[PDB]
Amino acid sequence: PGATLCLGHHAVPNGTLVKTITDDQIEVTNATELVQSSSTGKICNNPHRILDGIDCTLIDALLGDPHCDVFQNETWDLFVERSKAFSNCYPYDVPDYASLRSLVAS
Amino acid sequence: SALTQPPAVSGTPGQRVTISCSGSDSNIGRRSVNWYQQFPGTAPKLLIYSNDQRPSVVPDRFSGSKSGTSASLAISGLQSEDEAEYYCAAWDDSLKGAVFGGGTQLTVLPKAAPSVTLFPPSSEELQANKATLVCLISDFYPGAVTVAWKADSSPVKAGVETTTPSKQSNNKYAASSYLSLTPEQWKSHRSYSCQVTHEGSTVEKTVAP
Amino acid sequence: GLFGAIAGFIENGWEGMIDGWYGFRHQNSEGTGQAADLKSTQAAIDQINGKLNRVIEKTNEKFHQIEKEFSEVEGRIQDLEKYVEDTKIDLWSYNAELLVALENQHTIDLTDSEMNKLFEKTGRQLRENAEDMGNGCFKIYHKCDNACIESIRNGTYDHDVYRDEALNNRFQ
Amino acid sequence: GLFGAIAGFIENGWEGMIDGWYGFRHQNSEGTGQAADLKSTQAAIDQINGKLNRVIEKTNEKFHQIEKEFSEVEGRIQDLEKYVEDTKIDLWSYNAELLVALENQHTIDLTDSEMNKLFEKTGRQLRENAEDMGNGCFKIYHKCDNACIESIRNGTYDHDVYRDEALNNRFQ
Amino acid sequence: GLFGAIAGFIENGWEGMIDGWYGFRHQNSEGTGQAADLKSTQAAIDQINGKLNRVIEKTNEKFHQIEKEFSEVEGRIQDLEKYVEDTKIDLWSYNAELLVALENQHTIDLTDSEMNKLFEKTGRQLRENAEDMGNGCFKIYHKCDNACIESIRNGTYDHDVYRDEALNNRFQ
Amino acid sequence: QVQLVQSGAEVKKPGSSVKVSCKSSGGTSNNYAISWVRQAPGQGLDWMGGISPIFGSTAYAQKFQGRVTISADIFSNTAYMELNSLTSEDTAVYFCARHGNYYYYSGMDVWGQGTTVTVASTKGPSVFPLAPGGTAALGCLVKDYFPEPVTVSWNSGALTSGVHTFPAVLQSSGLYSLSSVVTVPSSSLGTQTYICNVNHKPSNTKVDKRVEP
Amino acid sequence: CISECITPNGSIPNDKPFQNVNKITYGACPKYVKQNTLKLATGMRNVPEK
C-alpha cells in the first residue's frame, strides 16, 4: 500500500530544429528567428526625413540643373537617388564626383 | 457569473465587513481564489492571492479564506478609502479559463436629497425644429434615483433618456435626464415636469412654454 | 544534456502536460493525476526570456557610411572599400553563428538542469519514505492521498508523520 | 569536470579496459570480470565524431586576392595591405584558439557526463537491491551470478525477483 | 548553476564560514561545530587563479602604429585610418565582453560543481550509515563523537565499524 | 518597476475590428503571462484570454474563441488583443494585466490603465444656451456629438467656481449629449457676461456660446 | 508608415539582431549577415518519444 510520484517535462508533436556546439540540427520545443530576411518593399517616410530625388541626382540638384531646381534649399535625413534620374543641362564632369556627392549627402 | 457574490455590502468606519463568493467544484473547489479591488474608472488592484495570501503593499486589515466551494474576503476595521467594487476570481477547469464573480459594491456608511434644476428648450433649438428638456440631478446619497417625466399631469412614455448615477467629488451622486419633444409637443401642453424620487421622497420641478 | 535528466533518466517528455514545462504525475489510492510545477517552469521561462532580451536588445544606429555597390571599375580604392565590407560581414556572420550555437547549447543544458533540480528537491523532501525507481519516479512507501501528494507538490510534506509506516514497508 | 565522475567519484580510469570507453567490472560467486558498455561508448564516440566533422568541414576556396609580400618600400598603400592581412590573421588566430578551448572544455564535460549517466542508469535498475558505495561501485545485496550481472549490463534486470532477498540482507 | 547545489539544495551560504570556501557543520553528542574543507576550497581557488592568470598574461607590445587623431579634414585616406581603428576597437570590445561572460558563467558553474563533488564524496563515505536529508545535510544513524566527525572530514571514516548500529536505527 | 501602458481610446463601427496594445515599460514582461480582461459598462470583469510569449502559450476564453486573436512582440515588449466583428455588445473598457508568473492561474498584480472601445460616425456637437434670489443657475447644452470626450470651459477658463459639467448620456442613436451648468450670484446677472466654450477634438469643433437671461 | 531601418529593398523591422536583406542600410538596423536564418532555442529539447 503506497503511491508513485513521477517527475517529468512537456513535449510537443513536432518542435523546431536548432544548431548547437555539438549538433548541426537538434529539436527543441520552440525557437525564435534572429535573422530578418524580408521587407515590405517600401521605404517608410517616418521617422526619418526622406527626400525622393525622382528625376534628379544629388549633384544635379546641387548645381541647379533646371529640372532639378525644385530641390533648391531642400534638406533630408536620407536622399534617395533613382535609377531613372537624368541630367539635362551643360555637359559636365566632377573629378572626385563620389567625394562631392558624399560630403553634400552627409 | 460562475462565481456568485452579493451585489452590495456596507459598514461603518471601523466595522468588520465580509464579502462572500460562491463557486463550484470546477473552480473554487479545486482551484485557488484571488480577490481584486476596483475604484470607479481605474484598473483593478490585486488584494489577495492563493486564497489567503496578501501582497506586501496591501494593508493587513484585508484577509481571505476558502472552504469547500466558497470563499470570503474580510475587511477588519473598515476605512473610508475602502469604498470600492470587490471581485473574487479563480481558474475554472471545466471552462479552461479564468472566471470572476459579478462584483460587490462596498459602501462606507448621511442621506442627502437631490438638488434638481430643469431647463426648458432654448429659443435657438426651437428654430432648429427640435426641443430638449434638461433635468439636472445633483448631490444625492445613496446613489440611486428614478426619474418620471410629466406632460401636463400625464406620464410621458417616449423620448426619455436618463444617465446612470455618477459619484461627485463630494462623494454624493449626480445624474441627468433628457426629454426630447417636437416644438409642437412643447406648444401642445401648458406644463412639463421632471419628477425625481430618491428613497421614497420625491423632488419635483416644472417649466412652462 | 549535461545533467542526464531530459532525454536521460526521464525517458521522454509528456505531450499531455499542456499547462507547464515541468511537473508531476501520481498514482495513489484515489486514482491518478497530473500537475504542473509552477516554480521550475517559471525559473526556466525567466532564464530564457532573460537571454532572449539580452540578444534582441539595442541594434546599432548608423547613418552615413561607405558605398558598397559600384557602377564602374576603379581599382585600388574600390578594392579596399569592398574588402573592408566583406571582412566586416564575414566577422558578424561568424559572431551570429557562434552566438546561437553557444546560447542553444546552454538553453538545452539549463532546461535539463531545472528538471534535475526539481527531481532532487522532491527526493530530499521524501527522506526515507520513498525510493528513486531510476526513471524519474519515486515509489512512496506509505498511503499518500490527494492532500498528501499536494503537500509534496507544494513543499510542505512532513516526512516524520509517515516515517514509521514507510520504514516498516521498505525494510520489513 | 562538471559532473564529478571522471577524475571524481570514479577515482581513476582502467588501462585494462581496452574494448570500450565505459564499462563494468564485477565480482560475484563465479569470479570476476569486465565488460565494455557499448551504448555509452558509442554515444561519446558519436558526439566527438559529430563535433570533429563540424570543425573539419568546408575549407573556404579563394583565388585572386591581394599581395602579401613586397620587394620595395612604397608607403601608404602597402601599409594598408599589410595591416589588412595582419588584422585578418590575428582575428583567425583568435578564432582558432577560442574554438579549441571551448570544444575541449566541452569534450571533457560530455565524456564526464556519459560516465555519470551510465552510473545513474545502473543505480536506477538496481532499485532497493543495492547501495552506492561512493566510488562508482554498487554493493548488490543478493546472490548475483554471471547471468544476473549480464541482465544488469543489458538492461533487463528484474529487481522484483531479488527484492525480498536483498532487503533481508540490507536491513536485517 | 548547472549542478543545483549552490543556490539550490544548499539553501544559502554561511557568512560564518570565514576560514574556507566549503565546509562542514555538525551536531553530535558533544555539541556543534564548523570546519572548512581545505581540499575543495583549494581546488576552487586553484582553478580560479588558473583562469585569472591565463587572462592577465602577456599584454601585446606595439610601437609605431598609425595616427588616430587628426587636426585637418583630408577625406579618403583619413576615412580609412579611422575606420580601421574603429573596426579594431569594436572587435576587441566584443572579445572583452564575451570573454568575461563565458569566464563568469563557468566560474559560477565550477564553484557549484566543487560544492556538489564534496557533498557526493561525503555521501559515499557514509554508505548505509546515513541518509541525505535533501538540504545538503546527512542524518547519521549512530553515535558519532568529535573524533568520528573528524574521521569523516579527513576521509578515513570506517563505515563498517558503525554499520550494525546504523542499520538498526534506520530500518528497525 | 514595470508599468503596462495601453493604446488610446477607440471608436469603431459595427462589423469592424479593433487591435489594442499593451507595452511593458521599465522592464520586460516576456517571462510572465499577460491576460486581457474586459469590463462592459456597469458590468463585471470578464477574461478574454492571455499569452505567455517565451513559454509559448496563447489561451482563449471559450466564449471569445474564434473572434479574438491575442499576440505578442517580444522585441518591443508589447502584447496585443484584436477583437473582430464588433457590435455594441463589445463596447467596454479593455485591460491588460500581468500574472505573478508565466501562467494564468496566479493573481494578476500589474494592470494597464485600460482602453475604452465604443462601437458612429464622428460628429461635432450643436451647442445651445440654458438661460437663468442670491444665486442663479445657467448653462450650455452640448448636443448630438460622437465620440467622447468634449471639454467645456466658461469665459475662456476664467470662470471655474460653481461649474458642474455632467457626464454625457449615450442616446439610442449612438450619439452623446451633455450639459454644463454654472452656479452664480444673481446680482451678477446684468453686468458679467457668461460664455461657454465647447471643444470637440475628434471633429475639430470649437464653439463659444453666450448665455443670456 | 514608420520604420527606423531603411534598406534599398525597403524598410525592415529592427526587432531582430541580424538581417540578410541588404548590406546597405540607414538608421537603427540589424547587422548584415550571410545566413538567411538563425534560430535561437526558446524551449527545452523536444523528446516526445524514447
Side-chain angles (χ1 to χ4, degrees), chain B residues 31 34 36 38 43-44 46 87 91 95 97-98 100 119 122 124-125 130 132 134 136-137 161 163 166 168 175 178, chain F residues 39 43-45 47 62 95 104-105 107-109 111-112 128-131 137 143 166-167 169 171-172 178-179 181:
Chain B
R31 294 280 182 173
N34 304 303
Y36 299 93
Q38 192 185 20
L46 182 64
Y87 294 92
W91 186 260
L95 303 165
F100 290 95
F119 288 102
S122 65
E124 297 79 342
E125 182 182 16
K130 296 292 177 187
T132 308
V134 178
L136 299 177
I137 316 161
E161 284 174 332
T163 69
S166 81
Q168 313 181 154
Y178 291 87
Chain F
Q39 182 167 44
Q43 308 293 316
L45 307 172
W47 192 67
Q62 290 176 357
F95 295 100
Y104 315 104
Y105 310 146
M108 300 173 282
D109 68 335
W111 289 70
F128 297 110
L130 301 175
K143 269 187 86 192
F166 285 70
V169 64
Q171 304 157 231
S172 61
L178 68 72
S179 296
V181 50

Side-chain angles (χ1 to χ4, degrees), chain C residues 37 39 44 64 69 87-88 133 142 149 155 161:
Chain C
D37 184 74
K39 199 174 183 300
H64 197 55
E69 290 179 22
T87 291
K88 176 183 175 193
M133 300 170 56
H142 62 84
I149 296 297
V161 163

Side-chain angles (χ1 to χ4, degrees), chain D residues 17-160:
Chain D
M17 168 156 288
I18 59 179
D19 66 344
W21 283 24
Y22 304 99
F24 299 92
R25 283 180 179 184
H26 71 270
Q27 178 157 220
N28 61 11
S29 59
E30 306 200 64
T32 65
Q34 179 183 257
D37 184 74
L38 303 184
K39 199 174 183 300
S40 56
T41 291
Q42 194 62 56
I45 285 170
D46 284 347
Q47 289 175 71
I48 285 165
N49 279 335
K51 66 164 61 199
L52 179 57
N53 289 155
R54 292 225 63 200
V55 164
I56 68 180
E57 178 181 40
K58 282 174 92 302
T59 62
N60 67 164
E61 203 171 33
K62 302 300 185 190
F63 300 118
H64 197 55
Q65 299 159 60
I66 57 164
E67 302 297 338
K68 301 174 178 189
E69 290 179 22
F70 304 86
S71 61
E72 289 78 43
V73 165
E74 297 174 296
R76 187 178 189 165
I77 298 311
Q78 188 181 128
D79 290 336
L80 185 58
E81 290 161 328
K82 287 178 161 184
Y83 188 78
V84 161
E85 189 65 7
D86 199 44
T87 291
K88 176 183 175 193
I89 290 165
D90 283 351
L91 287 160
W92 277 110
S93 299
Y94 175 85
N95 288 337
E97 196 71 36
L98 179 67
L99 176 60
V100 308
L102 292 173
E103 290 275 10
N104 290 347
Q105 193 84 29
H106 178 256
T107 292
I108 287 165
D109 288 332
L110 82 85
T111 51
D112 191 18
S113 159
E114 290 302 326
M115 182 77 271
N116 193 59
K117 291 191 265 189
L118 182 56
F119 183 79
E120 291 195 358
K121 175 168 68 158
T122 303
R124 279 167 175 138
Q125 290 192 257
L126 294 168
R127 286 284 287 272
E128 300 302 322
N129 301 348
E131 299 174 13
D132 179 351
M133 300 170 56
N135 62 348
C137 293
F138 292 99
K139 185 173 175 171
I140 296 169
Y141 282 85
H142 62 84
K143 296 184 179 184
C144 195
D145 66 13
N146 287 351
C148 177
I149 296 297
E150 178 50 30
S151 78
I152 302 159
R153 294 190 311 222
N154 69 18
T156 66
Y157 174 86
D158 185 344
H159 82 100
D160 272 310

